[PDB]
Paper text:
The T5 family of viruses are tailed bacteriophages characterized by a long non-contractile tail. The bacteriophage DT57C is closely related to the paradigmal T5 phage, though it recognizes a different receptor (BtuB) and features highly divergent lateral tail fibers (LTF). We present a composite map determined by electron cryo-microscopy (cryo-EM) at resolutions ranging between 2.9 Å to 4.9 Å of the entire T5-like phage particle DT57C, and atomic models comprising its core structural proteins. Our results provide a complete atomic structure of a T5-like phage, provide insights into the process of DNA ejection as well as a structural basis for the design of engineered phages and future mechanistic studies.
The tail of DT57C is composed of 40 stacked rings of tail tube protein (TTP), with each ring containing three subunits. The tail has helical symmetry and 3-fold rotational symmetry, with a rise 41.8 Å and twist 39.5°. While the local resolution of our reconstruction at the flexible Ig-like domains was too low for de novo model building, a predicted structure fitted the molecular envelope well. The tail shaft structure of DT57C is nearly identical to a previously published T5 tail tube structure. To better address tail flexibility and curvature of the segments, we performed asymmetrical reconstruction without imposition of any symmetry, which clearly revealed the presence of TMP inside the tail. Thus, the overall TMP organization within the tail tube of the phage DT57C can be described as a three-stranded parallel coiled coil, with α-helical secondary structure at least at its N- and C-termini (in accordance with secondary structure prediction).
Author numbering:
A (entry chain D), B (entry chain D), C (entry chain D), D (entry chain D), E (entry chain D): 3 to 376
């Protein structure tokens, strides 16, 4: 009874009218997790007398926001309906992108064209976010998260493992369901889709890094040894306290979302190498420098190959550190910084199965490698 | 010199007149531990001048309460003298039971009859407790703990390991002894006793759980995957501070003693199963529910078999949690709650080598399975 | 003194009242083995000083479960008392079948009728098993195993050697006996029985295999080159650790028993041949397929002939492998899988001296080839 | 049906357009091997209750990389088309040489001229390698390995046996074929070729060794007793884990390829003999020495004779060992070391049917014995 | 060149002033072995980039302790100079006996008198041992081990083969020598010595065993089927790690030396036979029993005959085991145990060419069979 991965996961914008447009099934890894916790309070009495007592009574106070998390592979493929690049989980990317309706052609948040899929953060600064719903399925059992919201996404550029993304978020409540709400197989993925998928994996070790200085126009060639980057949202949940009858969270505040990254490499002695960058950074000692950072997951080729691209137009670089690893490991940490307070952040995320270096240049320049850049 | 387990342990009510009635030897496991610590204080001076100095002098301040702990197996057997069930370590059970004299027939605290041994907490709420003495013996060496008091007892219902109990407590001081105080072998256990013992072990995996709702009279069948329960006392030690000549603890306060427990199981889809209980608990959301909990260590049979029983007449159940184990592990936590402030707690602990299911029903109903229950 | 095979073996349900009903002598092969081992622990001291020392003292800790094993031929014959097929060693088959009393007519576990002998696993899932006793006899000497339990049985379908079974198990202790406990010859086999036996051997090379697909209703004809199958129980022994006076095992846990098998053949190019099965299995790549497997040890005939039958109603087949043997050897591995968690496994084992193909069909269909199948 | 060596082996760069230029048949020895394996996972449940259960279900997880291996003789002969030395299996030598297109005249990787055939490792450091295809043929049956890559090559310089090479590699999958893909005889070898071949065998026992010190310019004469050398690649295969529907390897990483060797001899007392080398090596104790090593398989002559040559320009020699063989056997182990991290390794491998000592000197000096060395 | 056994072996206390008193030649068997090994470490780099590399450089790290071992026959004979029994290899026996100077009359370690040669372990517990030197000689070549120390000695009491001892040890370094250091023939054995030797061999099959119980004063007669015993030292070598210039061992720690033994026999049914001992040992189950064990290699006679004696005054016997050999083989294992931590071990080893049973009794009683025992 109740085998582990017989669970299946669906995400929906609304709780009724499920179809291939408002609902989507997503592939999941092994370590999927979800749960819901409650607060407790112990009260006891202490007395100075001849006949000491105990009596103590704890009471349930309230419910914490239900937690959920999983991981999935990066997976671009062409939709036969529109002839455009798309990923199975693009609903959640839109949810993280903005708190308004889906429009994959309006260029805001998440969008696509015949060549590639792009994600930006132009219209995300809200007090709330696009409210979604997560449905979990087991053998003859259903459950779902009410009013789930995404909080944190992380990507680890490993040297050996396949590229993946890890997602975590919270919701108001976890509730089981009495019956089957919608078709488990009609709205799911299909065999020919997965046949196209089997060629869309990212060959992780080919990932390449590019750096450019915004002060002296200097550039460096930096071989790398893996790293990470992370987008956060700092969600918070509000809760009134009528503890005489238990309380439930009523809403959420979207704090300041964040984008950070970290890189590792060897200290290399070469022209415009890691040694030169390290010396420049040490001698600089400026309060605020500016740099442009490009990560090409899967590498790049003159031909059409699968790849993903992370772009930072204004990232400020911290002072690097040297470790005692076997061969002189070096580490660098960087943050996203928008130009002035209210303007857009780095934003540009790109994914496709057919990037070429020329298209990569356009994608870096404008956030879209398809059309002619200025 | 000084082989490890050549240590032997005795417990006595008084320091003189040792015999089989006021002293008892108990079997011990490998990980027995004991020790005594002291406090220290460092004083130093800092000066703003041309000739900086150091001088610093630490002083011994006081002694902390000596700590001791060990573990032993649950072990019921019939005493040939009285024809009643008894355990070798029933002195310490009485000590935890009440702060007054031993009476195994007064039904208060610890008692027994021809069928089984029972322990209750009717008369334990004191500012102190029954003061005992622990003697430790090594090859040609003796030591003892002055005014030891029990604090914490824990029982782990494991799926595979034999049932055991772990005991920890404190005392005023640890003092070595110059000579042999009392006979090491005359007051110890004997061979025929241990021959009877070898059949008194508890076959742990047979342990069974029963739950009953006090609101809707509902009951559930819950297969389990091990768990724990714990009794605490929250002892505290008082100490005046004449640090010009070192200090020693002078007495103890018995805080609020406690009884808690935790259980684990699989999410099972069956009538009155774990799924039904989980749904009821989630939908309930009441501040204070009430339940009756029965643990039968060793299981039960219509025939006479060795077993132990833990009874909770009023335990309140917390909201259960679901883990990401290989097959949908679920966890439940519960506490003992007395009816109103000053009345007796759950209390009922039962042990014997010959429980039957009919006797188990009476034991659950009244705390004694021998006589006719109402 | 003490010639080797002058040993004789008896098995009994109880230690007293030995007769032809509760005790049975079984034929044994040459390689019979039995023994009992003990654990040891070495303690030593290391010191940093000018006068280094040695002293080290090992102590006996406990006894491991006594091991025993042997082998015997498959041997069906008709009992003149009941007019039903029976095997000399059917006590141990019942012991492996269930942990309750013998009933060769209740159809549970092991049973028989006027035509054949059957064994099933309907009522075997216990924490323990039917506790038996093994007596070994040598010239003027007796010994016995206390509380022996069967663990593992293996059958090797060889191309040339006679069919045989190999049995291994464990017990609490091995104990010699001071005198002759029961008649060595009155309860043993008799000459006329063995005269009937001499015709009951299995002509091993005639063994045949049948396979049926549960998805496409497909069947194949597979000539074979020998193989094996094995039933396991994963017994475990529990032992408290009072090492100051040596310990002895007190009980056993029956783990998950198991049924597995392996087959070998040549890659044959024929309609519904091994090549076709190999291609189907390679192209399938399904997570869980289902198949029905029939082994007929001794082959089958339209006439009455001696044979044994192994039936797997739901066996899942692993991906076969190809070896570099002289002519393209191929290997297949399979496991027993019950329908859902708690239901009965494959179970059906059949033995007789007079199987016919029509009776074989009924035996495959229902587990009993005597009565009319549905 | 299906006789053993009626198998024939072909290697192709592409799956279509088979001819004498993109496909080649190679001679094989007896012990050719190939296979493909799959992973399995067993899940079971353990419960503490009165009605213990079993149910366990294994699931197929994924496929391991298909393994293949064989051996063949070293075989140089002159091609009538180009008038240059060539070996039948030079496709696989090119595959091991580099991951780019064939060019037997560009001097990179594998090349040749009118005198001899050479192999180098100048352009092999890639993340992948030249992807080839292996076709295996049996009587009325075809199979092939998809995306096979070479991993390991070994050569054993035996005293008595003919020189041979052993090759092992892996591929994505093993797939049978429904029909005959290409002509089995038109693209194979021809009779006159084999008539030329019968004179191209290497008389193994004539193999000679030369050693030169790079520190003191010292040289030694070392009679040898056989040995080995090995080239490795440390290939690795990547595999996503969607185990709800089985997985297949998607790509490979080329690790660090390697070249090592080992030699054996007698301890000989002579000027510049093995004794002198042993004494020098023992007294040296330097961290990194440098040596030049030459192996001439088949020996050398002033006349034109068949031979092969292994050259190590920078090999570092480990400390030799002495064995207890009948006459004072001694063993030496050596590794290839490039000058600095990124430069070319030893590389130089030479093969021909007409080496002369003067040509051997040029081959040692430059890696090509045909043109005038500097 | 360099014939195998033309090697000769000498042992010396010091490296200069070689004579018949500080140097001795010993007979050796065929399988003599010696060698010296070194450690290696491989370092490699892995990079995630477009132009992957290899470069790897191993470095020599340090030298392990040189190993050496051989075997020789037990060989007592009378020295004409002192008129006392002596063995050719008594230097190494003294070395194993103690770490101080030789004194064959001080009764400590190794000593002798006019009747026999004795070895004890009274003064051996040191951090080091008597440092010796081993010289190996071949045709026109010399080598030696620097600071060799004995570690392990083994004796196999075989039924058919002549008695022998096997010795193994380690040293700091193995170094060849440029010239002849000392006379190879003047310090060696002489012809008349070997003429006396030819009568000093031990007729192995006559070896006898005696056992006595230290609890009930019981004794048994045990015919035996061979066995072994072993003395160990657990030497360890220390080594600093300056790997930038290679390291060499600088010293050794003598761990806990050890004495163990194992015996085999048939299960014999006789008064005080092996059956009785087996029953007593099985029923005993005591943690620590005590026994006295006597091995007489070569047997004993009322007349003067060559023999050796091993004495264990306090050996503790493990639980014996029964094997499936052709006739009921039984095995027993025993260890040496000193009385309390720091006192002397069994120690008593005796050798002579003229033991008599009466002298054997005295040797067992006191460790010396010559003088009058108490």
């Amino acid at each position: 009874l109740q085998l582990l991965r017989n669970t299946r996961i669906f995400v929906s914008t609304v709780k009724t009218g499920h179809d291939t447009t408002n609902t989507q099934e997503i592939l999941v890894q092994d370590d999927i997790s979800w749960g819901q916790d409650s607060n407790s309070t112990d009260i006891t009495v202490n007395e100075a007398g001849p006949r000491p007592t105990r009596g103590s009574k704890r009471f349930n106070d309230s419910l914490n926001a239900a937690e959920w998390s999983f991981s999935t592979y990066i997976l671009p493929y062409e939709d036969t309906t529109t002839g455009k690049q798309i990923v199975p989980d693009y609903m959640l990317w839109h949810a993280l992108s903005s708190g308004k309706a889906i429009d994959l052609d309006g260029d805001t948040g998440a969008h696509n064209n015949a060549t590639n899929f792009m994600v930006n953060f132009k219209d995300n600064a809200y007090h709330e976010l696009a409210m979604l719903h997560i449905y979990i399925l087991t053998d003859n059992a259903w459950s779902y998260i009410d009013s789930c919201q995404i909080n944190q996404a992380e990507v680890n550029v490993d040297i050996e493992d396949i590229g993946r993304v890890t997602w975590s978020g919270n919701g108001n409540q976890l509730i089981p369901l009495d019956e089957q709400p919608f078709d488990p197989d009609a709205l799911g993925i299909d065999d020919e889709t997965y046949m196209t998928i089997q060629s869309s994996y990212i060959k992780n070790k080919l990932t390449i890094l590019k750096i450019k200085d915004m002060d002296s126009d200097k550039e460096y060639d930096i071989p790398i040894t893996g790293g990470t980057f992370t987008i956060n949202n700092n969600i918070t949940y509000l809760t009134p306290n009528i503890m005489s009858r238990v309380n439930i969270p009523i809403g959420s505040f979207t704090g300041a979302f964040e984008l950070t990254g970290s890189l590792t490499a060897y200290l290399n002695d070469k022209s415009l190498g890691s040694m030169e960058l390290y010396k420049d950074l040490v001698r600089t000692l400026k309060v605020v420098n500016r740099f442009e950072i490009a990560l090409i997951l899967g590498g790049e080729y003159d031909d059409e190959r699968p790849a993903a691209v992370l772009v930072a137009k204004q990232a400020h670089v911290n002072i690097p550190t040297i470790e005692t690893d076997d061969v002189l490991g070096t580490s660098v940490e960087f943050k996203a910084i928008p130009t002035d307070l209210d303007t857009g952040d780095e934003g540009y995320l790109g994914f496709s199965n057919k990037y070429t270096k020329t298209t990569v240049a356009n994608l870096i320049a404008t956030g879209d490698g398809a059309e002619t850049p200025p």
